[PDB]
Design a protein around this ligand. Structure first.
Ligand SMILES: CCCC/C(C)=C/C=C(\C)C(=O)c1c(O)cc([C@H](C)CC/C=C/NC(=O)OC)oc1=O
Ligand SMILES: [Mg+2]
Ligand SMILES: [Zn+2]
Ligand SMILES: [Zn+2]
Lengths: 458, 1166
């Protein structure tokens, strides 16, 4: 019927809250953080990447202090690598310094940008894993006419080595003999796979789980915040009901509002007895106002420009009653920090300005722009003459020494392309430069008889 | 042997749906920012709704960053700023595009009435929207499960039904659904099903709906189009320099509304594009999408929803939709109609030294008008070095140039057109005579065509440039070739008013005058007898004269006589030429007769010598006027001697009828209705009082006693002559002046008994108002109404050219003189002159072929026909004309302002349309709309019914609101029984056989019937015989052809009755059948079949069936045509007229006739 009510009615599913479900979430959010924080705290290459850039930003906010903590971190790793490879305390107590390290990882914040990278990097690296994995199945199950029943029993063991491949061919079953036609292919996918086990530095088996607990941890919080905002549809309106009709149509400010809203929910911290709303209002009033000014007039316009305006707009209406008459830019700029034409330059870029498709009379219902003459195009008797110019002139150059002509025409692009430097015209002809100059002037000496062009002048 | 690739004399136009990829074939880029220009340095920011990076450089041949400003570095692109340097003209050619966040739905097809996205899905309107604004999910390919595909669930249901069937069914909501939907359906499929059900069930609502549905469909398949495309994913944006951003003085600005409108889509979209990446709650993004689809349709056809306001201004903005030119309907709308170079105008006056082929144009306009010809001609003879200066000479108005200009002018006609261009004569070519003044001078004789007086009418002028035009101008448009109204064979370049007073004056006779009874050699001594002061003009006198008569074999035969005439009439005979009877000027000469003199000179000595007559008929006609010194002063307006007498006499009657009324001998409506007669009678008498007295009471005396003769009072001679006046109007000067009717319509039982020569009293005046007011008002309207009418006709004639030579059919219609009860309301001769016959004509007695098969009936022929008592004639008329897609010359007839038979190519449609709608203005159920009733084909309120079938009648069942009437065939199956409302009076005989098409109730009857029942040569006579009672009633002479030719368009459709190849019930162009049956007749197979039945289609409803879609989409709803036309991917193979003009190539009639032909053969040619 009508988009707006729908939005409203749509919002109608109240779903109001008290303080309780308020904060109750904020942790649900926060879990998903850690859970994923923790989830990522797990990644060697997440961290070995952390080293490489650290070396890149440090080979190019207190640097030495920064140089220090990197040490605690750097210390706590290498030990843990040995709690793996030296296999002391078989991923039980060697497991623990693996844990100690991850803790070190779990403190403090950063820059959201490298983040969504790693986030990505993991999962894209996660891609290649199911990349290589999607290869083996179409090549054994669908290819070897091999049942999927038999494919998950034996492949699932390792999913990297060839233990299932050469053990499903010796089972002497009817689906086994087919596995040969792909021996060049199965060898190639398990290779890159173990390679990921090398690139990742973690078993392809164990590397899923972690990536996931992020992924879910992802949901938990994603899911969470979503809920938060829906709470406050009503907030936004109220305020956004303020900024209305300001050179911007309703739903727009409010959408923007629900952005300003939706933003606020992110930067928050419930561990703060400051009550959620008045933290919204700002971030809402933020976008919706800063929304308006930069996208509302048909010409953009910088901010301060907006403000410096309303300064005036307000003052003049303030000025008006002071001098119950009328305020003159000299006067107005007077009441100002402002210079003057600087002002006058200002006046002109207000006005939105009128639509050409405005009606004017009805002499035959005219329209405005039915009347804007062109200025680019060239007059016909204006163009025609030009035509007479090239000719009547070309009419003249022939009357001159065929050697001089090509020397002028070079100087003036005429009948040619780029206008030839009255030097480099020499250089082309040799006999430079002055030499040619005289030739030039020889031309001009003939205007005993230029009653032609002379007249094509005025 | 090459096709081509580059650019070429295309023909025809393809419209259709728009692939996204295909759309991207169009854009030089994606606008992606809502910016415009810089704000301080009024540059255009890239890349956004104006750019250069995309659309083009601002300034001819110039990169944006500006590194490259030379007419050298053209196709180069600036390294920096994505700008090829080229003329700025591209930023008026180039287009853009935008990628959408959400697929989004095209408001034209979603609402342009029968919603394509609707009926194509056979899914109702209300739901889709419901799906779109996210109200409810909809099924799609549910497969063997529990639910239909195009079925719809609520969220909760979807959820319930989700849990039951995990996959294996599909349901969505939001654009993608419908998108999803369309992609997925297969047409070809439903049809064959649709095809069967068509065959499985036999029911009229059904096959009406069904077969009508299918017919739409396979059209779509036949298109090329893809229904996934009725939805938008990428949107093209119109080039910037057309929704410009001009600066004004005082450097405010202005732009077209699209920019607002544009800026809105861009805005929403992005923010939305944004939203996703925020993974914002679908409750918002739902809303977003919903908003986008708003902005869009804002763009496209604002008005089909809440109607986005204009920004800034209250008022509504301009949607592409609104900016379609032609646009029109229904209906309006004129088209002004481009402006034009070489042109101008002013106030106009007389100029009677003008020989019909010329007009007086002022030195000054003529100067600026022909300026270049002058610039050239000046430097040619070399009075000017070079044009630049040549200009300065004419700038300077140097004396030389005046002489010069004369040169450019010599045989160089110009166009002269006046106010509402009615019939093609509203424009007429003259040669120009140079003149001082800033007035245009007019040839008087012509006034009467244009309709121009001189109380300020302005006529405007044009220049025919092309070599061509100067011939077109001279051959066709030139004053002279237009002197026979193409409306109606008579001359239109008749003696107007001033003049015939003069003529009438001369050709007159006073009883006993300066010369009563002498005899002079010949006119030569006749005039000499006058300017000598010796004879009176109109003193009766015998004189020697010679007429000629070319009776013999194409040959001129002389003859002398002592004709017994007057001096004046003698002196006139000087003017007459050769093959004319003296007998022609012997009498008194009315303007009534004097045009008739003119026609005759033309139908016997033909053009040239008709013309030069006409100038001389004028020149003279003025001169003896001025000499006669006719003039009017109060004393001329004779109020009959006995006026006041009667008044009181009838003034009596009334006091009588009163006496009786109060004594109630008699009633009120009675009395009234009584009184008002007698007043009526009085006015007829106080009329015919003066007129009896005014007429002749010129009682005078020669030699003897007294004689009385037709008066010379100044004003009689006005009306008597036809110069001016109407005895109807006279009666208002002398005798009583009518009766006024008050506003009611209800006429007042006490006439305005005084007149103009007498005072009017207050009350007399007062009542007299309302009238003249209402009148003025009428005219103001009848004229608004005449127009909208014509606009419709020409809308529908038009594409109709005299194409075929002689179709060669014997089939024609039967002419009788009109005989309305009493006396012949219109002779049989008028009806038939100029037509070409079906079959040879026999005398009264027989074995006597008078006229043989098809002959074009000239005057002689007629006269022969009238000599023989001859009395009815079958004739060839264009509703007969077998030729399809045109009109054979022969089927037609003859007219032109030129005398001989039509020549191929002339645009008889239009020129039909014209001659009707034109005089329509002067019309008076009845009158004008009563006309529209004919051509609109409107049933009357209460229409008679007729013998549906011939065969004996009988009434069955009973009175159940309607009596079923059962006709009964002697032979055939009898079953015809119609259910009739018996609450109206019958006529038919009850045990009587009823010839199908008999009067079975009385009262008006509805043409579609007459057609269907009685016949074509029947209906086709109804339309005219009845249009004709209107104009005829109004003294208005329009010849039937035209009407027939309209009628022809009315019945362009026909209904099939059998098959083999067409689609059984369908309504189709008797055209396409006439061709298609042919293509079975000995052609492929009998198959079978098919037969049809002719349909009567209202004009307006006729029009809107143009093969040409451009044509048609200018007459009705537009938004529709395109919408509906672009979907079945139509092509417009031109051919029609307008369409060629729009796209401004050459007219396929006229001149351009000769041309097009030359091409249509090369099309389908090898
Ligand atoms: C998009 C669908 C509609 C197409 C049209 C009508 C488009 C019209 C444009 C673009 C004009 O601006 C325009 C023209 O092109 C041309 C003219 C002339 C006055 C032609 C009018 C009469 C035509 N002939 C006719 O009726 O048959 C005798 O007047 C216009 O206003
Ligand atoms: Mg006038
Ligand atoms: Zn550049
Ligand atoms: Zn014909």
């Amino acid at each position: 019927t009508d988009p707006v009510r729908m939005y409203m009615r749509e919002m109608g599913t109240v779903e109001l809250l008290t303080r309780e479900g308020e904060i109750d979430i904020a942790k649900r959010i926060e879990d998903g953080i850690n859970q994923v924080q923790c989830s990522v705290a797990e990644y060697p290459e997440a961290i070995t990447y952390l080293l490489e850039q650290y070396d890149r930003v440090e080979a190019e906010i207190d640097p030495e202090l920064a140089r220090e903590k990197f040490a605690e971190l750097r210390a706590q790793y290498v030990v843990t690598r040995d709690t793996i490879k030296a296999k002391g305390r078989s991923h039980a107590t060697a497991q623990e310094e693996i844990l100690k390290l991850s803790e070190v990882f779990k403190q403090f914040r950063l820059v959201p940008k490298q983040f969504d990278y790693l986030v990505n990097s993991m999962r894209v690296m996660m891609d290649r894993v199911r990349t290589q994995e999607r290869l083996i199945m179409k090549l054994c199950v669908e290819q070897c006419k091999m049942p999927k029943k038999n494919f998950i029993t034996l492949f699932t063991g390792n999913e990297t080595s060839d233990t299932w491949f050469n053990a499903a061919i010796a089972m002497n079953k009817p689906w086994s003999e087919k596995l040969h036609d792909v021996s060049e292919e199965v060898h190639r996918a398990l290779q890159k796979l173990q390679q990921i086990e090398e690139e990742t530095g973690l078993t392809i088996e164990q590397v899923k789980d972690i990536n996931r607990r992020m992924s879910i941890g992802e949901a938990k919080a994603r899911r969470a915040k979503k809920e938060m905002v829906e709470a406050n549809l009503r907030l936004v309106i109220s305020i956004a009901k303020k900024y209305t009709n300001r050179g911007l149509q309703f739903l727009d400010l409010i959408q923007e509002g629900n952005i300003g809203l939706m933003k606020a929910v992110d930067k928050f911290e419930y561990r703060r007895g400051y009550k959620f709303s008045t933290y919204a209002t700002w971030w809402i009033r933020q976008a919706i106002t800063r929304s308006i000014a930069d996208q509302a007039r048909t010409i953009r316009i910088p901010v301060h420009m907006i403000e410096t305006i309303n300064k005036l707009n307000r003052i003049s209406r303030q000025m008006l009653q002071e001098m119950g008459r009328e305020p003159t830019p000299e006067e107005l700029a007077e009441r100002m920090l402002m210079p003057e034409d600087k002002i006058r330059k200002v006046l002109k870029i207000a006005k939105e300005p009128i639509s050409m498709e405005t009606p004017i009379g009805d002499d035959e219902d005219s329209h405005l722009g039915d009347f804007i003459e062109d200025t680019t195009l060239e007059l016909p008797l204006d163009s025609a003459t030009t035509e007479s110019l090239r000719a009547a002139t070309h009419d003249v150059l022939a009357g001159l020494t065929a050697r001089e002509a090509k020397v002028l025409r070079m100087r003036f692009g005429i009948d040619m392309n780029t206008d030839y430097t009255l030097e480099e015209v020499g250089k082309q002809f040799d006999v430079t430069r002055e030499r040619i100059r005289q030739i030039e002037a020889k031309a001009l000496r003939k205007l005993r008889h230029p009653s032609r062009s002379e007249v094509l002048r005025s | 042997l090459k096709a081509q690739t580059k650019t070429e004399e295309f023909d025809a136009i393809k419209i259709a749906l728009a692939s996204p990829d295909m759309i991207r074939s169009w854009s030089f880029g994606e606008v992606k920012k809502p910016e415009t220009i810089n704000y301080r340095t009024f540059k255009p920011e890239r890349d956004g709704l104006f750019c250069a990076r995309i659309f083009g450089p601002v300034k001819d041949y110039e990169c944006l960053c500006g590194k490259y400003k030379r007419l050298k570095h053209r196709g180069v692109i600036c390294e920096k700023c994505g700008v090829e340097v080229t003329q700025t003209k591209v930023r008026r050619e180039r287009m853009g595009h935008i990628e959408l966040a959400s697929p989004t739905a095209h408001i034209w097809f979603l609402k342009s009435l029968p919603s394509r996205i609707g009926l194509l899905l056979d899914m109702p309107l209300r739901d889709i929207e419901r799906v779109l604004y996210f109200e409810s999910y909809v099924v799609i390919e549910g497969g063997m499960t529990n639910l239909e595909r195009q079925q719809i669930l609520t969220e909760e249901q979807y959820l319930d039904a989700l849990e039951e069937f995990g996959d294996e069914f599909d349901a969505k909501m939001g654009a993608e659904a419908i998108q999803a939907l369309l992609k997925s359906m297969d047409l070809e499929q439903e049809c064959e099903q649709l095809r069967e059900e068509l065959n499985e069930t036999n029911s009229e609502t059904k096959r009406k709906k069904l077969t009508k549905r299918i017919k739409l469909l396979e059209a779509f398949v036949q298109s090329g189009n893809k229904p996934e495309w009725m939805i938008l994913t990428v949107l093209p944006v119109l080039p910037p320099d057309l929704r410009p951003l001009v600066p004004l003085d005082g450097g405010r600005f202005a732009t077209s509304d699209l920019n607002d409108l544009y800026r809105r889509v861009i805005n929403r979209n992005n923010r939305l594009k944004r939203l996703l990446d925020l993974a914002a709650p679908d409750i918002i993004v739902r809303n977003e999408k919903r908003m986008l689809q708003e902005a869009v349709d804002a763009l496209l056809d604002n008005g089909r929803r809440g109607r986005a306001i204009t920004g800034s201004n209250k008022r509504p903005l301009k949607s592409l939709a609104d900016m379609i030119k032609g646009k029109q309907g229904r209906f309006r709308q004129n088209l002004l109609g481009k402006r034009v170079d070489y042109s101008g105008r002013s106030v106009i006056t007389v100029g009677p030294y003008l020989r019909l082929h010329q007009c007086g144009l002022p030195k000054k306009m003529a100067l600026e008008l022909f300026k270049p010809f002058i610039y050239g001609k000046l430097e040619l003879r070399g009075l000017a070095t070079t044009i630049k200066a040549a200009k300065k000479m004419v700038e300077r108005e140097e004396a030389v140039v005046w002489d010069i200009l004369d040169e450019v002018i010599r045989e160089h006609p110009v166009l002269l057109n006046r106010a509402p261009t009615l019939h093609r004569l509203g424009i007429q070519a003259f040669e120009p005579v140079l003149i001082e003044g800033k007035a245009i001078q007019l040839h008087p004789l012509v006034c009467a065509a244009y309709n121009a007086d001189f109380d300020g009418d302005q006529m405007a002028v044009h220049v025919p440039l092309t070599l061509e035009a100067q011939l077109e101008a001279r051959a066709l448009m030139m004053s002279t070739n237009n002197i026979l109204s193409p409306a109606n064979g008579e001359p239109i370049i008749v003696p107007s008013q001033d003049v015939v007073l003069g003529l009438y004056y001369m050709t007159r006779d006073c009883v006993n005058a300066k010369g009563e009874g002498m005899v002079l050699t010949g006119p030569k001594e006749a005039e000499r007898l006058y300017r000598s002061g010796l004879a009176s003009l109109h003193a009766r006198v015998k004189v020697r004269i010679t007429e000629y008569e070319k009776d013999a074999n194409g040959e001129l035969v002389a003859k002398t006589s002592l004709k017994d005439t007057t001096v004046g009439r003698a002196i006139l005979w000087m003017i007459v030429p050769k093959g004319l009877p003296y007998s022609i000027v012997n009498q008194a000469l009315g303007k009534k007769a004097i045009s008739k003199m003119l026609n005759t000179c033309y139908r016997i000595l033909g053009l040239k010598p008709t013309v030069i007559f006409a100038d001389q008929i004028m020149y003279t006609g003025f001169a003896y006027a001025a000499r006669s010194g006719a003039s009017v002063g109060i004393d001329d307006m004779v109020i009959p001697e006995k006026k006041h007498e009667i008044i009181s006499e009838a003034e009596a009657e009334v006091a009588e009828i009163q006496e009786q009324f109060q004594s109630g001998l008699v009633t009120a409506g009675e009395r009234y209705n009584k009184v008002i007669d007698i007043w009526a009678a009085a006015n007829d008498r106080v009329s015919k009082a003066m007129m009896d007295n005014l007429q002749t009471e010129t009682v005078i005396n020669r030699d003897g006693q007294e004689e009385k003769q037709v008066s010379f009072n100044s004003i009689y001679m006005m009306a008597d002559s036809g110069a001016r006046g109407s005895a109807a109007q006279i009666r208002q000067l002398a005798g009583m002046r009518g009766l006024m009717a008050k506003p009611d319509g209800s006429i007042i039982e006490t006439p305005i008994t005084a007149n103009f020569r007498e005072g009017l009293n207050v009350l007399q005046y007062f009542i007299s108002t309302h009238g003249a007011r209402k009148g003025l008002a009428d005219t103001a309207l009848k004229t608004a109404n005449s127009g909208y009418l014509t606009r419709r006709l020409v809308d529908v004639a038009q594409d109709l050219v005299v194409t075929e030579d002689d179709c060669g059919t014997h089939e024609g219609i039967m002419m009788t003189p009109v005989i309305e009860g009493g006396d012949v309301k219109e002779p049989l001769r008028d009806r038939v002159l100029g037509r070409v016959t079906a079959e040879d004509v026999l005398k009264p007695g027989t074995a006597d072929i008078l006229v043989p098969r098809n002959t074009l009936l000239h005057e002689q022929w007629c006269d022969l026909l009238e000599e023989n008592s001859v009395d009815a004639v079958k004739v060839r008329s264009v509703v007969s004309c077998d030729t399809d897609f045109g009109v054979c010359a022969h089927c037609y007839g003859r007219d032109l302002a030129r005398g001989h038979i039509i020549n191929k190519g002339e645009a008889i449609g239009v020129i039909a349309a014209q001659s009707i709608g034109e005089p329509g203005t002067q019309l008076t159920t009845g009158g004008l709309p009563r006309v529209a009733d004919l051509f609109e084909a409107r049933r009357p309120k209460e229409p008679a019914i007729l013998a549906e079938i011939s065969g004996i009648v009988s009434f069955g069942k009973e009175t159940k609101g309607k009596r079923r009437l059962v006709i009964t065939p002697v032979d055939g199956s009898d079953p015809y029984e119609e259910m009739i409302p018996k609450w109206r009076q019958l006529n038919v005989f009850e045990g009587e056989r009823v010839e199908r098409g008999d009067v079975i109730s009385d009262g008006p009857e509805a043409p579609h019937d007459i057609l269907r029942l009685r016949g074509v040569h029947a209906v086709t006579r109804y339309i005219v015989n009845e249009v004709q009672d209107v104009y005829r009633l109004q003294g208005v002479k329009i010849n039937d052809k035209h009407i027939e030719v309209i009628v022809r368009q009315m019945l362009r459709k026909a209904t099939i009755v059998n098959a083999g190849s067409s689609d059984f019930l369908e309504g189709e162009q008797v055209e396409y059948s006439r061709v298609k049956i042919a293509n079975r007749e000995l052609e492929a197979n009998g198959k079978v079949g098919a037969t049809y039945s002719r349909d009567l289609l209202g004009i307006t409803k006729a029009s809107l069936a143009t093969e040409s879609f451009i044509s048609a989409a200018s007459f009705q709803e537009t938004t529709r045509v395109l919408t509906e036309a672009a979907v079945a991917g139509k092509r417009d193979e031109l051919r029609g007229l307008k369409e060629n003009v729009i796209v401004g190539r050459l007219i396929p009639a006229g001149t351009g006739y000769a041309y097009h032909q030359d091409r249509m053969r090369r099309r389908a040619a090898g």
